[PDB]
């Protein structure tokens, strides 16, 4: 029903993540970011911005608003959006896993398309493609295909 084995990736408690996280370096984040009180406070503002009434074109606006309101460097916000295929829903999932596991980008997270994931999609190898679809699903698979034949 309303159950998914993907919940474990969104279910991360921000109160268990010490602020600022060791992975949150100055080359990815702005001085404002380091002035949030908790990981929860940052997460809550991230959700606030992400939940704006943006039209699919306004990717440039969102990247600016993430920079001004949450202190995420513009280049890093763009990189994240690209590997997320534009899906704003998986934006908080990125940061939760990036901070918890102390890895940028999170390697094995559904919806977070690594470089090696794209190399597997580029190859017509049905073994690599079975591993990919078992990670992101046919939904994200057809979205990534649609995304790159248009790239």
């Amino acid at each position: 029903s309303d159950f998914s084995n993907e919940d474990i990736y969104d279910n991360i408690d921000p109160d268990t993540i010490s602020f600022p996280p060791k992975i949150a370096t100055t080359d990815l984040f702005l001085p404002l970011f380091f002035h949030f009180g908790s990981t929860r406070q940052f997460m809550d503002k991230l959700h606030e911005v992400i939940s704006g009434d943006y039209e699919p074109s306004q990717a440039e606006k969102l990247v600016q608003d993430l920079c001004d309101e949450t202190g995420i460097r513009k280049n890093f916000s763009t990189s994240i959006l690209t590997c997320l295929s534009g899906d704003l829903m998986v934006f908080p999932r990125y940061f939760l896993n990036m901070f918890k596991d102390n890895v940028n980008p999170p390697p094995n997270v559904p919806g977070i398309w690594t470089h090696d994931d794209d190399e597997s999609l580029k190859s017509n190898d049905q073994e690599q493609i079975r591993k990919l679809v078992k990670k992101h699903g046919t939904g994200r698979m057809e979205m990534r295909k649609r995304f790159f034949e248009k790239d």
């Binding site: 704006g52 943006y54 039209e55 699919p56 074109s57 959006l81 295929s85 534009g86 899906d87 829903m89």
Partner: peptide, 13 residues
Amino acid sequence: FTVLRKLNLVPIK
């Protein structure tokens, strides 16, 4: 501007 105009957002319900 190049990657951002080409990129499409998937907003929240």
